[PDB]
Short mmCIF file of all heavy atoms in Angstrom, two decimals:
data_model
loop_
_atom_site.label_atom_id
_atom_site.label_comp_id
_atom_site.label_asym_id
_atom_site.label_seq_id
_atom_site.Cartn_x
_atom_site.Cartn_y
_atom_site.Cartn_z
N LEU N 1 0.83 -1.20 0.02
CA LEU N 1 0.01 0.02 0.01
C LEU N 1 0.88 1.21 -0.02
O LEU N 1 0.70 2.16 -0.85
CB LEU N 1 -0.92 0.00 1.19
CG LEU N 1 -1.77 1.20 1.54
CD1 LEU N 1 -2.54 1.60 0.37
CD2 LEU N 1 -2.57 1.05 2.70
N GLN N 2 1.85 1.33 0.94
CA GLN N 2 2.68 2.46 1.02
C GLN N 2 3.60 2.72 -0.27
O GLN N 2 3.70 3.82 -0.73
CB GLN N 2 3.64 2.39 2.24
CG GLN N 2 2.92 2.53 3.56
CD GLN N 2 3.96 2.80 4.67
OE1 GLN N 2 4.56 1.84 5.12
NE2 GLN N 2 4.18 4.01 5.09
N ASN N 3 4.16 1.65 -0.80
CA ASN N 3 4.97 1.80 -1.94
C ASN N 3 4.13 2.25 -3.21
O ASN N 3 4.56 3.21 -3.91
CB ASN N 3 5.67 0.52 -2.31
CG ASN N 3 6.71 0.14 -1.18
OD1 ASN N 3 7.23 0.98 -0.45
ND2 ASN N 3 6.90 -1.09 -1.06
N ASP N 4 2.89 1.67 -3.40
CA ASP N 4 2.16 2.08 -4.49
C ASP N 4 1.66 3.51 -4.35
O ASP N 4 1.73 4.31 -5.27
CB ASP N 4 1.04 1.01 -4.71
CG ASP N 4 0.37 1.20 -6.05
OD1 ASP N 4 -0.39 2.13 -6.30
OD2 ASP N 4 0.75 0.42 -6.97
N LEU N 5 1.13 3.82 -3.15
CA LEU N 5 0.64 5.15 -2.85
C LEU N 5 1.63 6.20 -3.05
O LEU N 5 1.42 7.29 -3.61
CB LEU N 5 0.06 5.13 -1.46
CG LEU N 5 -0.71 6.45 -1.12
CD1 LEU N 5 -1.92 6.62 -2.03
CD2 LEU N 5 -1.03 6.47 0.38
N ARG N 6 2.91 5.91 -2.64
CA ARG N 6 4.01 6.89 -2.75
C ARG N 6 4.35 7.15 -4.22
O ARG N 6 4.59 8.26 -4.59
CB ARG N 6 5.14 6.40 -1.97
CG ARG N 6 4.86 6.63 -0.52
CD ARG N 6 6.00 6.21 0.41
NE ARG N 6 5.70 6.27 1.73
CZ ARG N 6 6.45 6.38 2.76
NH1 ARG N 6 7.80 6.42 2.57
NH2 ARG N 6 5.97 6.41 4.07
N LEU N 7 4.32 6.13 -5.10
CA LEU N 7 4.52 6.29 -6.44
C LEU N 7 3.43 7.20 -7.08
O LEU N 7 3.78 8.20 -7.75
CB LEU N 7 4.60 4.95 -7.16
CG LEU N 7 4.66 5.05 -8.74
CD1 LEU N 7 5.82 5.97 -9.14
CD2 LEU N 7 4.84 3.63 -9.22
N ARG N 8 2.13 6.94 -6.77
CA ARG N 8 1.15 7.71 -7.37
C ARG N 8 1.24 9.10 -6.91
O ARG N 8 0.92 10.05 -7.65
CB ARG N 8 -0.29 7.16 -7.06
CG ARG N 8 -0.39 5.59 -7.40
CD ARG N 8 0.10 5.22 -8.74
NE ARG N 8 0.31 3.76 -8.65
CZ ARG N 8 1.01 3.13 -9.70
NH1 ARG N 8 1.48 3.77 -10.80
NH2 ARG N 8 1.13 1.79 -9.53
N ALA N 9 1.41 9.29 -5.54
CA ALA N 9 1.44 10.63 -4.89
C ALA N 9 2.57 11.41 -5.52
O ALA N 9 2.50 12.66 -5.78
CB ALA N 9 1.56 10.46 -3.36
N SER N 10 3.68 10.77 -5.82
CA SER N 10 4.93 11.44 -6.35
C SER N 10 4.56 12.11 -7.70
O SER N 10 4.93 13.20 -8.00
CB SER N 10 6.05 10.48 -6.59
OG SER N 10 6.62 10.03 -5.33
N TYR N 11 3.89 11.46 -8.61
CA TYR N 11 3.53 11.94 -9.93
C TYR N 11 2.42 13.03 -9.69
O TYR N 11 2.58 14.03 -10.30
CB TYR N 11 2.85 10.82 -10.75
CG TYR N 11 3.66 9.78 -11.31
CD1 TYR N 11 3.26 8.41 -11.33
CD2 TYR N 11 4.89 9.92 -11.84
CE1 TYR N 11 3.95 7.33 -11.99
CE2 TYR N 11 5.69 8.97 -12.41
CZ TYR N 11 5.19 7.67 -12.43
OH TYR N 11 5.90 6.57 -12.98
N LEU N 12 1.41 12.71 -8.90
CA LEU N 12 0.28 13.62 -8.82
C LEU N 12 0.69 14.88 -8.28
O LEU N 12 0.12 15.95 -8.71
CB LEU N 12 -0.80 13.03 -7.89
CG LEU N 12 -2.06 12.51 -8.39
CD1 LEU N 12 -2.96 12.17 -7.11
CD2 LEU N 12 -2.81 13.41 -9.33
N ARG N 13 1.48 14.96 -7.28
CA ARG N 13 1.85 16.10 -6.60
C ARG N 13 2.52 17.12 -7.63
O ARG N 13 2.18 18.30 -7.70
CB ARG N 13 2.75 15.83 -5.38
CG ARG N 13 2.97 16.92 -4.44
CD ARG N 13 4.01 16.66 -3.37
NE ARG N 13 3.54 15.52 -2.59
CZ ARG N 13 2.70 15.72 -1.49
NH1 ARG N 13 2.29 16.90 -1.11
NH2 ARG N 13 2.38 14.59 -0.73
N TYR N 14 3.44 16.56 -8.37
CA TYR N 14 4.19 17.26 -9.36
C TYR N 14 3.36 17.69 -10.57
O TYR N 14 3.26 18.84 -10.98
CB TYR N 14 5.38 16.36 -9.91
CG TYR N 14 6.38 17.13 -10.62
CD1 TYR N 14 7.55 17.47 -9.97
CD2 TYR N 14 6.18 17.63 -11.91
CE1 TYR N 14 8.51 18.29 -10.60
CE2 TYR N 14 7.06 18.43 -12.59
CZ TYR N 14 8.27 18.78 -11.93
OH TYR N 14 9.25 19.57 -12.62
N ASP N 15 2.55 16.81 -11.09
CA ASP N 15 1.71 16.98 -12.19
C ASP N 15 0.58 18.05 -11.86
O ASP N 15 0.27 18.95 -12.66
CB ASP N 15 1.03 15.82 -12.73
CG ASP N 15 1.96 14.81 -13.48
OD1 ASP N 15 2.94 15.30 -13.94
OD2 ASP N 15 1.80 13.56 -13.37
N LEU N 16 -0.05 17.93 -10.72
CA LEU N 16 -1.09 19.03 -10.32
C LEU N 16 -0.41 20.40 -10.22
O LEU N 16 -1.07 21.28 -10.61
CB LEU N 16 -1.89 18.58 -9.17
CG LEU N 16 -2.74 17.38 -9.38
CD1 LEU N 16 -3.38 16.88 -8.04
CD2 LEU N 16 -3.84 17.69 -10.45
N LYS N 17 0.72 20.48 -9.71
CA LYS N 17 1.47 21.74 -9.71
C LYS N 17 1.61 22.28 -11.17
O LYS N 17 1.42 23.48 -11.34
CB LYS N 17 2.80 21.63 -8.99
CG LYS N 17 3.46 22.92 -8.82
CD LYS N 17 4.72 22.91 -7.78
CE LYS N 17 4.48 21.81 -6.66
NZ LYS N 17 3.47 21.93 -5.69
N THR N 18 2.07 21.48 -12.06
CA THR N 18 2.21 21.81 -13.45
C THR N 18 0.89 22.37 -14.04
O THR N 18 0.82 23.35 -14.68
CB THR N 18 2.69 20.63 -14.22
OG1 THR N 18 3.97 20.27 -13.72
CG2 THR N 18 2.90 21.06 -15.70
N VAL N 19 -0.22 21.55 -13.78
CA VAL N 19 -1.49 21.92 -14.27
C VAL N 19 -1.97 23.24 -13.73
O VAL N 19 -2.37 24.11 -14.52
CB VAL N 19 -2.54 20.81 -13.94
CG1 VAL N 19 -3.93 21.36 -14.27
CG2 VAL N 19 -2.16 19.50 -14.65
N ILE N 20 -1.85 23.45 -12.43
CA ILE N 20 -2.18 24.67 -11.77
C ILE N 20 -1.40 25.89 -12.46
O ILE N 20 -2.00 26.99 -12.70
CB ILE N 20 -1.97 24.67 -10.28
CG1 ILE N 20 -2.94 23.73 -9.72
CG2 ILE N 20 -2.00 26.03 -9.67
CD1 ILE N 20 -2.57 23.24 -8.30
N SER N 21 -0.11 25.70 -12.66
CA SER N 21 0.68 26.75 -13.28
C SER N 21 0.18 27.23 -14.57
O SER N 21 0.35 28.51 -14.94
CB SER N 21 2.15 26.33 -13.39
OG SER N 21 2.71 26.23 -12.08
N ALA N 22 -0.42 26.38 -15.36
CA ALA N 22 -0.94 26.75 -16.71
C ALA N 22 -2.40 27.15 -16.69
O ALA N 22 -2.89 27.71 -17.70
CB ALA N 22 -0.80 25.56 -17.60
N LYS N 23 -3.01 27.03 -15.54
CA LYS N 23 -4.48 27.46 -15.48
C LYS N 23 -4.58 28.99 -15.47
O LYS N 23 -3.69 29.66 -15.09
CB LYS N 23 -5.14 26.88 -14.16
CG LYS N 23 -5.54 25.35 -14.30
CD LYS N 23 -6.67 25.18 -15.17
CE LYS N 23 -6.96 23.60 -15.25
NZ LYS N 23 -7.92 23.26 -16.34
N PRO N 24 -5.68 29.51 -15.89
CA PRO N 24 -6.04 30.90 -15.75
C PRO N 24 -5.90 31.37 -14.26
O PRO N 24 -6.20 30.61 -13.33
CB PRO N 24 -7.47 31.02 -16.31
CG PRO N 24 -7.70 29.78 -17.19
CD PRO N 24 -6.82 28.78 -16.48
#
């Protein structure tokens, strides 16, 4: 659970920052 969650969280945290930066 921990290892899988950490992988997903690693991508999401970074990707959502990217997405926010391009939003209006």
Side-chain angles (χ1 to χ4, degrees):
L1 171 57
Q2 285 193 287
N3 294 330
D4 197 283
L5 187 65
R6 289 179 186 203
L7 176 52
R8 312 311 165 192
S10 289
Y11 288 142
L12 252 189
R13 191 189 295 275
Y14 198 99
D15 291 331
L16 292 170
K17 187 166 332 293
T18 299
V19 170
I20 289 160
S21 288
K23 280 288 172 191

